[PDB]
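User: Can you model how zinc ion sits in this protein?
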Amino acid sequence: AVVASLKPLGFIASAIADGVTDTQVLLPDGASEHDYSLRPSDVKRLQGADLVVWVGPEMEAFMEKSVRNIPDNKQVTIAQLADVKPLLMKHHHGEYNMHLWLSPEIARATAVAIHEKLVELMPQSRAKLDANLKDFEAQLAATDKQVGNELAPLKGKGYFVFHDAYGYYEKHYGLTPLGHFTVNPEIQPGAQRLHEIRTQLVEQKATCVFAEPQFRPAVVEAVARGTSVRMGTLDPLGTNIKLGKTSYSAFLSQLANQYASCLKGD
Ligand SMILES: O=C(NO)c1cn(Cc2ccccc2Cl)cc1-c1ccccc1
Ligand SMILES: [Zn+2]
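Assistant: Here's the modeled complex, given as structure tokens:
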């Protein structure tokens, strides 16, 4: 099996590995990067993998140690790929945005790297692997066209998010975020912080404020209350999407729908 650290990396790997080997996701969606410690059973899975796919030590810091013993020809470390360097832009404490799965261009380079490793590891399946890469790139191009068109009429509409993640996706499709607020998903900001957030919401003319699935509706409402800003939800992990050949294209389209759902009209 190919073992991917995070679900959207699973989406990409499952496009390339389809009909060749299973794709597995290491961690449940609810986990994170610095508090999370790997179970010995997780380490075993990594070492048993045909191929490990992860962003790298600036993102899944918790697995850097586990991945040292795995040979280079059995891992794709996305942040360290040669073709990914010119695609990086300025796990949140590092210098670069490491939410790399949100860049269609980085997804493409990831798929190429996965394909290349798999062909070396499983040359008996080269043709199927070539076919899978061909199909992934064709879907990505088609999705890219479709999403770009869905999001084009939304240009210029401002919004805030509770997570500085989406820059790769927003720059690529020409969305115009105003900025981000650090908000605890379980606990609303204090009186002073909330005042400052709410005034920026109105002052900067935001159409929407976007939360994520793990935010308690109460804290989102507390942020949006009084302002005339519509509330939205973005899911940067596509938690509801199953692994499979078409999953990464489905993820990019679902994210567009989530943006559009709050942003369009008014
Ligand atoms: O980037 C982030 N935090 O700053 C994330 C945001 N999420 C969204 C999320 C968290 C918990 C449960 C569901 C979801 Cl969609 C997941 C991560 C995340 C997951 C694994 C590793 C690092 C981050
Ligand atoms: Zn993040």
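A couple of observations from the model: The chain has nine helices and eight strands. Residues 11 and 243 are 5 Å apart (CA to CA).
User: Helpful, thanks.
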